[PDB]
């Protein structure tokens, strides 16, 4: 509910710049909690966001682009395995959850849901926010230093995703060459298209 | 009067007829017969009271949405281009008459995109700062298009985003953007997405 | 001429309607005796499921079916789920001089329009001599057909002016 409320509140601005602080400072109001406050946003709201009815009506706004961009920002540095021990949270984060479906991890886990989410988005015939949701959130995800799209040499979705969106140019040059495996060959198929 | 231009065009645009397809040993029209009949037209309506341009110009855009015909409509709209080029059919008045009544959002989706790229081609309007009703036309058919209308006709209608975006964009050099600012009152009430 | 019991009926405005059950149906059981005069057993869920959630428009389908062995459409990147639901490839692969293939984007299949596209006209036609002559008759004949159909019309029209212009 902190980060539902959170939300609520952010999507009510209707500003560029006041979104662009909003995040800015939402990133870091998030710390010290990064890892468990991450997954059960993302993988609670987005998928609540991008799912339901009303929830489309609420991110047509600019204050999608800035979501987008809070969301990715935060599952990049969750990515990272830093202790980021807390003082008080160090103890009451002591609870078991299987999660509700690399390795088998809950971060892990989440971003694989996510990804799979990204990719039923992109399925057609009925959309209008979020399809431009998840171009801006692609978009976004376009950036240096990125270890996102886990790309497992076997048949991880991420890279048919992106020949997805490549069908919906430096965007396809993104996930070119990750593993440097025939994978890379079908995006580079994708992009000579 | 009317009606005399109304048999000329029809004459003239709807010179097809039904010719047993089989195929005769018998063999531009894009390029003669219709420069030829743009030239009568405009002697025509040069020497048939100039003053009726307004509604003459209706009647020719009314005509043009009649017919289906995609290919058919595409070959008008650059008759009507040209007819733009030898300084007839002042910009301001045909697209005036041409966004309004006309342009029936989600009714020819192939004919919005094909008089949205006619306006493309004449993007510039190059008039005073009678690009005021123009602008706030072409608002009101944007939102008259609610958040859920497919995902297969996208790129279709983009066509007006790119409109604005070329607007907006030269607008730093073609036209004072604080016209444009105080044009887009009926869109934001101090912020409403 | 018996107009009574047609103006009582249409008199009879009210919701109530048992009266004519106790003034005809005792006649009716007295006279025809049927215990029970329809004996079949009607118990009927009728709709289950009816939908393949695959299919693109069918009047489409119905085309792409009664195509000639000659002609083959296939799918592009497909900005086509539902709505536009064709932006195809069709090779004219024929016995004459092959060419390149067309768009010949569509709109909804109930066809109050045709397909033409003409995208690849940019450097596929103006790079050839013949390929230029192509498509010179074959825009005028495509400005005269009355409302082209879009599978079968269209690609004979463009076999027919790429077969004809070739003289």
């Given at each position: 509910?902190?980060?539902?409320?959170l939300?609520?509140?952010?999507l009510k601005?209707?500003?560029?710049?006041?979104?662009?602080?909003?995040?800015?400072?939402?990133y870091?109001?998030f710390?010290?909690?990064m890892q468990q406050?991450?997954?059960?946003?993302?993988?609670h709201?987005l998928?609540?966001?991008?799912?339901?009815?009303?929830?489309?009506?609420?991110?047509?706004?600019?204050?999608?682009?800035?979501?987008?961009k809070?969301?990715?920002?935060?599952?990049?540095?969750?990515?990272?395995?830093?202790?980021?021990?807390?003082?008080?949270?160090?103890?009451?984060?002591?609870?078991?959850d299987?999660?509700?479906?690399?390795?088998?991890?809950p971060?892990?886990?989440?971003?694989?849901?996510?990804?799979?989410?990204?990719?039923?988005?992109?399925?057609?015939?009925?959309?209008?926010?979020?399809?431009?949701?998840?171009?801006?959130?692609?978009?976004?995800?376009?950036?240096?230093?990125?270890?996102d799209?886990?790309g497992?040499?076997?048949?991880?979705?991420?890279?048919?995703?992106?020949?997805?969106l490549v069908?919906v140019?430096?965007?396809?040059?993104?996930?070119?060459?990750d593993?440097?495996?025939?994978?890379?060959?079908?995006?580079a198929?994708?992009?000579?298209? | 009067?009317?009606?005399?231009?109304?048999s000329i065009?029809?004459?003239?645009?709807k010179?097809?007829?039904?010719?047993?397809?089989?195929?005769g040993?018998?063999?531009?029209?894009?390029?003669?017969?219709?420069?030829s009949?743009?030239?009568?037209?405009?002697?025509?309506?040069?020497?048939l009271?100039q003053?009726?341009?307004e509604?003459?110009?209706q009647?020719?855009?009314?005509?043009?949405?009649?017919?289906?015909?995609?290919?058919?409509?595409?070959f008008?709209?650059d008759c009507?281009?040209?007819?733009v080029?030898?300084?007839?059919?002042?910009?301001?008045?045909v697209?005036?008459?041409?966004?309004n009544s006309?342009?029936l959002?989600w009714?020819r989706?192939?004919?919005?995109?094909?008089?949205?790229k006619?306006?493309?081609?004449?993007?510039?309007?190059?008039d005073?700062?009678?690009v005021?009703?123009?602008?706030?036309a072409?608002?009101?058919?944007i939102?008259?298009?609610?958040?859920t209308?497919?995902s297969?006709?996208?790129?279709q209608?983009?066509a007006?985003r790119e409109?604005?975006a070329?607007?907006?964009?030269?607008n730093?050099?073609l036209?004072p953007?604080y016209?444009?600012?105080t044009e887009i009152?009926?869109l934001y009430?101090?912020?409403?997405? | 001429?018996?107009?009574?019991d047609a103006?009582?009926?249409?008199?009879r405005?009210?919701?109530?309607?048992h009266?004519?059950?106790?003034?005809?149906v005792?006649?009716?059981?007295?006279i025809?005796?049927?215990?029970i005069?329809?004996?079949?057993v009607?118990?009927?869920?009728?709709?289950?499921?009816?939908?393949?959630?695959?299919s693109?428009p069918?009047?489409?389908q119905?085309?792409?079916?009664?195509?000639?062995?000659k002609?083959?459409?296939?799918?592009?990147?497909?900005?086509?789920?539902?709505?536009?639901?064709?932006?195809?490839?069709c090779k004219?692969d024929?016995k004459?001089?092959?060419?390149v293939p067309?768009?010949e984007?569509?709109?909804?299949?109930?066809?109050?329009?045709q397909?033409?596209?003409?995208?690849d006209?940019?450097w596929?036609?103006?790079?050839?001599?013949?390929?230029?002559?192509?498509?010179?008759?074959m825009?005028?004949?495509?400005?005269?057909?009355?409302?082209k159909h879009?599978?079968?019309?269209?690609?004979?029209?463009?076999?027919?002016?790429?077969?004809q212009?070739?003289?």
């Amino acid at each position: 509910w902190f980060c539902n409320n959170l939300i609520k509140e952010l999507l009510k601005e209707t500003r560029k710049e006041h979104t662009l602080r909003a995040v800015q400072l939402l990133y870091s109001i998030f710390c010290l909690d990064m890892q468990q406050v991450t997954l059960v946003l993302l993988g609670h709201i987005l998928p609540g966001l991008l799912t339901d009815s009303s929830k489309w009506h609420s991110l047509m706004d600019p204050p999608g682009t800035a979501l987008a961009k809070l969301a990715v920002w935060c599952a990049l540095s969750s990515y990272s395995s830093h202790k980021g021990q807390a003082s008080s949270r160090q103890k009451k984060r002591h609870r078991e959850d299987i999660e509700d479906y690399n390795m088998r991890d809950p971060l892990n886990r989440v971003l694989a849901n996510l990804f799979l989410l990204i990719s039923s988005i992109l399925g057609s015939r009925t959309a209008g926010p979020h399809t431009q949701f998840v171009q801006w959130f692609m978009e976004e995800c376009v950036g240096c230093l990125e270890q996102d799209s886990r790309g497992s040499i076997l048949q991880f979705m991420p890279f048919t995703t992106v020949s997805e969106l490549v069908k919906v140019s430096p965007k396809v040059v993104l996930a070119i060459t990750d593993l440097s495996l025939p994978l890379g060959r079908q995006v580079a198929a994708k992009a000579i298209a | 009067m009317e009606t005399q231009l109304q048999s000329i065009f029809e004459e003239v645009v709807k010179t097809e007829i039904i010719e047993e397809a089989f195929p005769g040993m018998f063999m531009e029209d894009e390029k003669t017969k219709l420069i030829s009949c743009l030239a009568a037209f405009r002697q025509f309506w040069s020497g048939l009271s100039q003053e009726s341009h307004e509604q003459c110009v209706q009647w020719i855009v009314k005509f043009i949405h009649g017919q289906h015909s995609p290919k058919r409509i595409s070959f008008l709209y650059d008759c009507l281009a040209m007819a733009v080029e030898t300084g007839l059919l002042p910009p301001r008045m045909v697209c005036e008459s041409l966004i309004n009544s006309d342009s029936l959002e989600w009714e020819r989706t192939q004919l919005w995109a094909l008089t949205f790229k006619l306006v493309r081609k004449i993007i510039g309007g190059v008039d005073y700062k009678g690009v005021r009703d123009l602008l706030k036309a072409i608002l009101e058919k944007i939102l008259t298009i609610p958040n859920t209308v497919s995902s297969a006709v996208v790129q279709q209608l983009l066509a007006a985003r790119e409109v604005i975006a070329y607007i907006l964009e030269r607008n730093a050099c073609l036209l004072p953007a604080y016209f444009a600012v105080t044009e887009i009152r009926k869109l934001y009430p101090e912020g409403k997405l | 001429q018996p107009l009574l019991d047609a103006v009582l009926a249409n008199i009879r405005s009210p919701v109530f309607n048992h009266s004519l059950y106790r003034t005809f149906v005792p006649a009716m059981m007295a006279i025809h005796g049927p215990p029970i005069v329809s004996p079949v057993v009607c118990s009927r869920k009728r709709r289950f499921e009816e939908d393949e959630r695959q299919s693109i428009p069918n009047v489409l389908q119905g085309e792409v079916a009664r195509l000639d062995p000659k002609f083959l459409v296939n799918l592009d990147p497909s900005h086509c789920s539902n709505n536009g639901t064709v932006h195809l490839i069709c090779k004219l692969d024929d016995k004459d001089l092959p060419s390149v293939p067309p768009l010949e984007l569509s709109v909804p299949a109930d066809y109050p329009a045709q397909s033409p596209m003409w995208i690849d006209r940019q450097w596929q036609y103006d790079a050839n001599p013949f390929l230029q002559s192509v498509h010179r008759c074959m825009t005028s004949r495509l400005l005269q057909l009355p409302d082209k159909h879009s599978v079968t019309a269209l690609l004979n029209t463009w076999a027919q002016s790429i077969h004809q212009a070739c003289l």
